[PDB]
Each structure stands twice: as structure tokens, then as C-alpha cells.
Design a protein around this ligand. Structure first.
Ligand code: MET
Length: 531
């Protein structure tokens, strides 16, 4: 029941430089982790890089450098990218890590001791780019790097090749019923629901046994050896999925450096993951293979898998080679880091393929962040309206006052359910519905007129507004981590009241609390042009 809340992103292939997809996945992971830290929970948030395999090894060869130098460099690009995005991830794991390799061999050996690994053959299609085994139903005709006729994945469009190899096989066929029993006993374990239904449909049809090794030549000897068989390398996906178990067993110092691998996951109280964040492209690996490996090894299953969609820009596919780039840092430098995160999390739900455009980014920045949130923060901290620069003591509440108070009191329960699904978009919308109501209340009450006309009434109006802004800001702090600090500083909210479920309560900050110092010229979110 009480354990460290454990949330993960995928670990990303290091065949190419990091891009928006990786940033988005890790963002979602970060937001979920931050919300749980805001509730006062212990959190461990994990991300990293998937560095073995034919895909990564062949990408190294193309650049004409050693896999060790290639992976170290690209991993460094991912780390730097994520530092720049200003996340709060607790550890960055690399599959080349020696302690991860130990955990993989340990798991392999468990699957083997269990009787679930035998020496067999795979003869069939393989997508090197997705490191994915495919049936003939999942391939079709296409053209290759030369424009010659070939076969491609229906899923990804990447070139497929026919593999015929003696491989170690995991008895995935034997886990059909246990997987179905898991899905049904936990009908919230895969999100969104239609992706859950997809997984169930696939497993219902039956599962073939899964190749978990490859001949070493095929992988250019860039992989983890099979314990007891140095001619075979461990399937990159079994290696990769194991990162979640490894990460749950690493003690990390202040620097973010791994200092020690514990023998048993219970010691650190992280495993199993509470939320595995993934893209829709890798659902089968996480919802079918992974729980099967865990069932086999006698390990506990993840509580939830959330699978999101794929971004476009200007209604077209993102690619530098096609002439349509989407650089997060460039966009964050122009519009703001928190604002860019807000947009990515607000514009689209997990069931959708989001679309970025500068038009729409500016519409949300101006309309929601500046006009709704920012305006409201300026109004209730203004020396023109809040003449004493403090949280006033309210007088008697009217029915209209109380209808707004009710929305503010209900908001935390509602945002919370949404964050836990998780459905971050709906959490944001719920908060901003309350911000829109506060603004409309402020417009109705015209506190600027009240200063001269009814100072007693202004106390009430101003207090409710401040408290609404505080509560909405608190719930938005996972989304706007830097701007929420600025807001709290402007409101004079003491540190202790900026986290903890105690402070989801209306009334946490007392009358008399002093506003923070006003800086000359500043605005929270500055609007931008609509050319
Ligand atoms: C264990 S998650 C592995 C994800 C994979 N490396 C990818 O980029 O799709």
C-alpha cells in the first residue's frame, strides 16, 4: 500500500538525436512524478536510453564510429536535452550499465529455471528499425532506400527482412489465459481504454512463442550474452524492458550517479511500476511481453500502462529530411518552457495524435496562460486593487461567493482523479474551468470599483480570488513548475503551503499573509503577435 510511487518513461534507442517524441514521453513521466511529489508522496521517476541491438549497432557503423563511442555520445545528447527541458527525473538509466546487465542475466536465468525458455527457431519477418517480430498479416509491399520493391511493416512503414535462425524462445503462448485474467481483473491497467481493448483482442486470438535470443553475428556482437551460451545475445527488448526492474534496484547519490545495486526489489520499495508511460508504437512489448516475463519470473506486475499518440507539425509528419522540423528547445526559447509544456499537455489527450502549430501555440499562450491565468494573478496582486498588499480577512459570503468557493473546494478531488487515471489534459481543463469561473466572478464584482465604494465587500471578493488562484496554481504546479513558483512568490504563499494534501483545502493561507514584492514591468506570460 505505502511504497515509493514509481513512474517510468520508455528508454529510447540511441540511433539518432533526441526529438519531440522523446521529450513528450519523458514530460508525461515527469508531470506524473511531480504531481505525486506535490501530494507529499515518495516518488522515483525513471528515464533513459536503450543502447544495444542491431538497430543501434548499424547506426553506429553508418557514422563510422565504434558502438561504445556512438552510444556514449548520443546518450549524452539525450541527457543534455532532458537537462535543458528542466524535468525532475530521479535517474537516467543506460542499458550499457554493468549493473543492468547483471539484472538481465538474473532475469533470464529465472525465466529459464522456470521452464519457460527453450531452444527453437524463428523463421519469419523482422523489422530491424522497430526490433519487432512480425507476422505476414503485418507486412505489405513498399520501396527501400534505393526505390526497389521490398516488404515493409504495416505498423511503421519500415523495411522488413526475413529471418531464419536457431533462437532461444520464451513460451509466450502459455501465458494467454493469465494475461487475459490480468486485463480483466484490472480494467484500468491500460489507458486509454480503446488501447486496452486492442491488447485484449490481440491476446484473445492467441500468442506465438517469442524469440528472446539472436545469433551473435546478426547483432554485430553488440548486446548482452545469453548466460551459458556465448553464441547467443539476449533480445534487445528483453534487455530493454528489464531497465524498469534494474532502475527499481539502484541506489542513487545526490549527483544522480548510481552507487549500488540491491539484491531484492523490496529493499527500495519501487517495483513494480505504478505507471509505465509509453507511446502507442510499443504497446505490445509493455502490455503483453513484459507482464508475461514477470509472471514467469514470479515478479509483480505494473499497476498501469499509459500509451499516448504521435505528434505532427502543421498537419504534416515531423522529419528534418522532409523539411518539417519541430525543435522543442527552439520553441521553448521563443515561447517559454512552462508554456511549451502546457501546450503539449493541453492540446492533445493520450488517445489523440496531437498537432503543433505556432498559430495554436500562440492562441493557447495568449488565451489561457496570459488572459485567463496571468490576468487574474495581476488583478489580485495589483496595488490599485489590493491596496494593503495582503490577504484580506473576508466578511460575509453571498450565495454567488459560495458558488465559486464550491468550485474551488471541489477542484482538488476532481483534478486528483484525472491525474491518477492518468489523463493530464482533463486535469488541466478542470483547473482552467475553475480559473475561467474566477475571472467571470471578478468581472461581475468589479473590485476596482469596490475599492472606493465598498472596502468591506472588496475584502471578501479579493480573498476568494487569491485563494482560488492559490489552489488552481497548486494543482497546475506539475504542469507549470517554474511559473507556479513565481505565482506563489507574488501571492506571498509560505513554502510549507506550496505542497501537501493539507493545502488542497480552501483556507490554507491565513488573512494577514503578506504579498510578495512587486517588480517593475514584470508580467507572468507576455502575449505574442498573430502575424
Ligand atoms: C523498454 S522501452 C524500449 C523503447 C525502445 N527503445 C524505443 O525507442 O522504442
Amino acid at each position: 500500500v505505502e511504497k515509493v510511487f514509481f513512474v517510468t518513461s520508455p528508454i529510447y534507442y540511441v540511433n539518432a538525436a533526441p526529438h519531440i517524441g522523446h521529450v513528450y514521453s519523458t514530460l508525461i513521466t515527469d508531470v506524473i512524478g511531480r504531481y505525486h511529489r506535490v501530494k507529499g508522496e515518495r516518488v522515483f521517476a525513471l528515464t533513459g536510453t536503450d543502447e544495444h541491438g542491431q538497430k543501434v549497432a548499424e547506426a553506429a557503423k553508418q557514422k563510422q564510429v565504434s558502438p561504445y563511442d556512438f552510444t556514449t555520445a548520443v546518450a549524452g545528447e539525450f541527457k543534455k536535452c532532458f537537462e535543458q527541458m528542466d524535468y525532475s527525473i530521479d535517474y537516467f538509466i543506460r542499458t550499457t550499465n554493468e549493473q543492468h546487465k547483471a539484472v538481465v542475466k538474473e532475469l533470464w536465468t529465472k525465466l529459464e529455471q522456470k521452464g519457460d525458455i527453450y531452444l527453437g527457431r524463428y523463421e519469419g519477418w523482422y523489422s530491424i528499425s522497430d526490433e519487432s517480430f512480425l507476422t505476414p498479416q503485418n507486412i505489405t509491399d513498399g520501396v527501400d532506400k534505393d526505390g526497389n520493391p521490398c516488404k515493409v511493416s504495416l505498423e511503421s512503414g519500415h523495411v522488413v527482412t526475413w529471418v531464419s535462425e536457431e533462437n532461444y524462445m520464451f513460451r509466450l503462448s502459455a501465458f494467454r489465459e493469465r494475461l487475459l485474467e490480468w486485463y480483466h481483473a484490472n480494467p484500468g491497467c491500460i489507458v486509454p481504454e480503446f488501447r486496452r481493448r486492442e491488447v485484449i483482442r490481440a491476446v484473445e486470438k492467441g500468442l506465438p512463442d517469442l524469440s528472446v535470443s539472436r545469433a551473435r553475428a546478426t547483432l554485430h556482437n553488440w548486446a548482452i550474452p545469453v548466460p551459458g551460451n556465448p553464441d547467443h545475445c539476449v533480445y534487445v527488448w528483453l534487455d530493454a524492458l528489464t531497465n524498469y526492474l534494474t532502475g527499481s534496484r539502484l541506489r542513487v547519490d545526490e549527483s544522480g550517479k548510481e552507487v549500488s545495486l540491491v539484491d531484492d526489489f523490496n529493499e527500495l520499495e519501487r517495483f513494480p511500476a505504478d505507471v509505465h508511460v509509453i507511446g502507442k508504437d510499443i504497446l505490445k512489448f509493455h502490455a503483453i511481453y513484459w507482464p508475461a516475463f514477470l509472471l514467469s519470473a514470479g515478479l509483480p506486475l505494473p499497476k498501469k500502462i499509459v500509451a499516448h499518440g504521435w505528434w505532427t507539425k502543421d498537419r504534416k509528419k515531423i522529419s528534418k529530411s522532409l523539411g518539417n522540423v519541430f525543435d522543442p528547445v527552439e520553441k521553448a526559447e521563443e515561447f517559454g518552457y512552462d508554456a511549451l509544456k502546457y501546450f503539449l499537455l493541453r492540446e492533445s489527450g493520450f488517445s489523440d495524435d496531437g498537432d503543433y502549430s505556432d498559430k495554436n501555440m500562440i492562441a493557447r499562450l495568449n488565451g489561457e496562460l496570459a488572459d485567463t491565468l496571468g490576468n487574474l494573478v495581476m488583478r489580485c496582486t495589483s496595488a490599485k486593487i489590493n491596496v494593503n498588499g495582503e490577504w484580506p480577512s473576508p466578511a460575509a459570503y453571498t450565495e454567488e461567493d459560495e458558488s465559486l468557493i464550491q468550485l474551488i473546494k471541489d477542484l482538488p478531488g476532481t483534478a486528483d482523479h484525472y491525474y491518477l487515471i492518468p489523463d493530464i489534459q482533463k486535469a488541466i481543463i478542470a483547473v482552467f474551468d475553475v480559473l475561467r469561473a474566477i475571472n467571470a466572478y471578478v468581472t461581475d464584482m468589479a473590485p476596482w470599483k469596490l475599492v472606493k465604494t465598498d472596502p468591506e465587500r472588496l475584502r471578501t471578493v479579493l480573498y476568494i480570488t487569491l485563494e482560488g488562484v492559490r489552489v488552481t496554481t497548486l494543482l497546475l504546479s506539475p504542469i507549470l513548475p517554474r511559473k507556479s513558483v513565481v505565482i506563489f512568490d507574488m501571492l506571498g504563499v509560505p513554502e510549507v503551503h506550496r505542497k501537501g494534501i493539507e493545502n488542497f483545502e480552501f483556507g490554507a493561507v491565513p488573512p494577514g499573509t503578506r504579498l510578495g514584492p512587486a517588480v517593475e514591468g514584470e508580467v507572468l506570460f507576455s502575449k505574442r503577435s498573430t502575424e
